[PDB]
Design a protein around this ligand. Structure first.
Ligand SMILES: NC(=O)c1ccc[n+]([C@@H]2O[C@H](COP(=O)([O-])OP(=O)(O)OC[C@H]3O[C@@H](n4cnc5c(N)ncnc54)[C@H](OP(=O)(O)O)[C@@H]3O)[C@@H](O)[C@H]2O)c1
Ligand SMILES: NC(=O)c1ccc[n+]([C@@H]2O[C@H](COP(=O)([O-])OP(=O)(O)OC[C@H]3O[C@@H](n4cnc5c(N)ncnc54)[C@H](OP(=O)(O)O)[C@@H]3O)[C@@H](O)[C@H]2O)c1
Ligand SMILES: CC[C@@H]1C[C@@H]2C[C@@H]3/C=C/C=C/C(=O)NCCC[C@@H]4NC(=O)/C(=C(O)/C=C/C=C/[C@H](O)[C@H]3[C@@H]2[C@H]1C)C4=O
Ligand SMILES: CC[C@@H]1C[C@@H]2C[C@@H]3/C=C/C=C/C(=O)NCCC[C@@H]4NC(=O)/C(=C(O)/C=C/C=C/[C@H](O)[C@H]3[C@@H]2[C@H]1C)C4=O
Lengths: 354, 354
């Protein structure tokens, strides 16, 4: 029936550590056969996400394959038994491609460090989106990142009035959502952030203290900074960084504390693989530590619940969900790069509109 | 008024690592004032416990003070408002002393690494003990050790049929109790032990595989031993060791796994303070790690449920709770020493009948 030219960002070289996106990725033109299988759809990409967790997915991606990524897509054509119809908008792991063919079923990540399964594509309904909660939020506060923060705060962490809550890597959408949900529950909220500008942004979002993690680059300096910012100890810790900040938080865990492990930037990106053993510090505190893998919460009931509980708060700007949307498919690797190298100007969820 | 002759084992010297009991402790004669305040009791020690965790309490004990320890005591005399009457039996942290005066109230551990509070003395009721479950079990399966294992397995761990459960430090009372409860719950049970004979003992109690930790003396060999013994991964881990055994387990945690941290022998005793960071391994598995401090479970309701539930299993002989009762106050340090240097003959809980 035909073909169409497309563009893809493919993985040209594996580079450990902080990504050098200009070296890692190559933009290629790809002729795509558009004859559809019975359950297959042709999809046009509208938005893609860039996220730190892509750094390790990339390293597990075979050379020459396209870079996976969360995306918003529009069904251009569909086989008779396709899960979605032409004109439908869907969210799913479509990757850094202008167009793609897929049946939208769950897909095992065959080369992954962990055998994760990417979920089935999710149908979006325009009627839930307005200028206050735009369609792009299906990749942020109404998408994965929102589900990560909200699932953690309603399914694991039980913040109580007077808790002290610490958020490492708090400048992004997930950490600021966590921080604001904790403040609404009556907590004192401490975060870490990378510049004076971000620190004042977090403060004006409700954070009681913000530590400059670049200045406090040791566990000693971090302990010092945490003892000032959290004088009564730490009841909850939402951890995206690991490394020396986490070592310091574990020196001051209160009885009954909870730790959610959302990411470990210090290990995955900075290759800080060794350090003080932490389990010796959780016995007397009876601390509970839980790894987060928010894919487990991708259910219809949870999305409806997220839209209900979070959608209202957001559109009134009570709970603040910002985004930084770059324009242009050719700029996806550069937007990704800012996460690691030039984040000072970024606010909320960084996306690219294609 | 009056006084009496008493003997105490006091702390003569602080040495880290594996204790030299003959060197660390000295038996002294102490004149004890037998004049009682309104609520105080004069108590005679009937049995005392020796435990690995006394190694760290000792190092926090001022030179010259008696060595704390869990004990069973009988009231010889009592003030008018004492909680217990002459002849009553109590369990509490009376220490390595033939006699002592106390009001039996909760007492802060002033010099403790952690602000632990020793609980109020617990009245023992002879109706609970018989030849199958003797009075001495108030220091073992019907005491702190039993409460630690029963509490962890009923209030935190949710073993399911077909689970694989790993227990490090499996040859002690707590480990063997956890292992047999896991087996009752339908699990495949893997333990670590120190000799072929102790491995066969664990196999007699229901363990499905036992790893020799003296041979698998690093994470690599332990990883390989574990892979052979737990080919389908690890669902639950009851950890009293830490160190490279725990490093190995964390490389093979299944989705939804649970880890209970009961002690960290490799760090506390062997001074293994640094190692691979473990939190990077718990995110995809969505593992839950919980520190155990079983003092929080010392309530009247829990002691009654423990006697009903665990006491019944022991009496019905569905569950085996061994004790090694050494005779003689003068031999307390030697009994303690067998925990570290000669445990081959130690079955289960080691204690001293005075
Ligand atoms: N486990 C899961 O299921 C799951 C799900 C979704 C996302 N995640 C992860 O969760 C994390 C947060 O998500 P997000 O979208 O809100 O990302 P994010 O935190 O905005 O990610 C980038 C930011 O990390 C900060 N950063 C870099 N190095 C740091 C350090 N050493 N200490 C503290 N902050 C540092 C920088 O903020 P400054 O500008 O303040 O320096 C940078 O802008 C990411 O790692 C993501 O991969 C996990
Ligand atoms: N967190 C809490 O609330 C709590 C409460 C009570 C007790 N505890 C601690 O829990 C632990 C278990 O108590 P228990 O009474 O059953 O003690 P235990 O396990 O009998 O303690 C000594 C035993 O540890 C074993 N061991 C020594 N080094 C080892 C290693 N590297 N790997 C494996 N096993 C090793 C030896 O077994 P082999 O003879 O087989 O070598 C020895 O017989 C103790 O450390 C105790 O202090 C914690
Ligand atoms: C359409 C749904 C869409 C699919 C994307 C895929 C992500 C997964 C990333 C996995 C990365 C990975 O496997 N690297 C190798 C191991 C390194 C590291 N170790 C981890 O355990 C870990 C993590 O848990 C990250 C978890 C992040 C989870 C997000 O929720 C989803 C994200 C959601 C929103 C790591 O990054
Ligand atoms: C009358 C009741 C009677 C009182 C005794 C005292 C124990 C307490 C021990 C505390 C030890 C301690 O402070 N060392 C210094 C820190 C090193 C290490 N770090 C820990 O976190 C830890 C631990 O948590 C041990 C936990 C042990 C829990 C027992 O159930 C009770 C035990 C019960 C049965 C350690 O040993």
């Amino acid at each position: 029936l035909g073909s169409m030219k497309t563009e893809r960002w493919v993985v040209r070289e594996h580079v450990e550590g902080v990504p050098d996106a200009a070296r890692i990725y190559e933009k290629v033109e790809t002729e795509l056969n558009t004859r559809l299988g019975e359950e297959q759809m042709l999809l046009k990409t509208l938005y893609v996400s860039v996220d730190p967790y892509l750094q390790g997915i990339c390293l597990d991606t075979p050379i020459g394959d396209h870079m996976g990524a969360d995306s918003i897509m529009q069904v251009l054509d569909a086989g008779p038994n396709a899960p979605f119809r032409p004109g439908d908008l869907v969210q799913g792991f479509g990757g850094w491609r202008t167009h793609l063919v897929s049946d939208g079923k769950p897909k095992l990540w065959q080369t992954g460090t962990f055998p994760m399964v990417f979920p089935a594509y999710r149908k979006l309904d325009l009627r839930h989106y307005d200028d206050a909660l735009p369609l792009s939020t299906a990749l942020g506060v109404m998408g994965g990142p929102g589900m990560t923060a909200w699932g953690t705060m309603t399914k694991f962490m039980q913040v109580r009035p007077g808790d002290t809550v610490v958020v490492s890597g708090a400048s992004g959408m997930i950490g600021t959502l966590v921080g604001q949900m904790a403040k609404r529950a009556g907590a004192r909220v401490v975060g870490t952030a990378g510049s004076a500008g971000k620190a004042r942004y977090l403060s004006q979002l409700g954070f009681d203290a913000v530590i400059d993690y670049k200045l406090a680059d040791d566990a000693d300096k971090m302990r010092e900074a945490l003892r000032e910012a959290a004088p009564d100890g730490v009841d909850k810790y939402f951890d995206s960084i690991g490394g020396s900040v986490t070592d310091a938080v574990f020196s001051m865990l209160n009885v009954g504390s909870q730790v959610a492990v959302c990411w470990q930037w210090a290990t995955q990106v900075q290759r800080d693989y060794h350090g003080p053993r932490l389990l010796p510090y959780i016995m007397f505190p009876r601390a509970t530590i839980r790894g987060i893998f928010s894919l487990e919460w991708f259910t219809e009931q949870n999305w409806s619940a997220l839209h209900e509980e979070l959608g209202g708060l957001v559109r009134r700007q009570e709970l603040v969900a910002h985004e930084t949307v770059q324009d242009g498919f050719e700029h996806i690797p550069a937007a990704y790069q800012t996460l690691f190298s030039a984040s000072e100007s970024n606010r909320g969820k960084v996306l690219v509109r294609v």
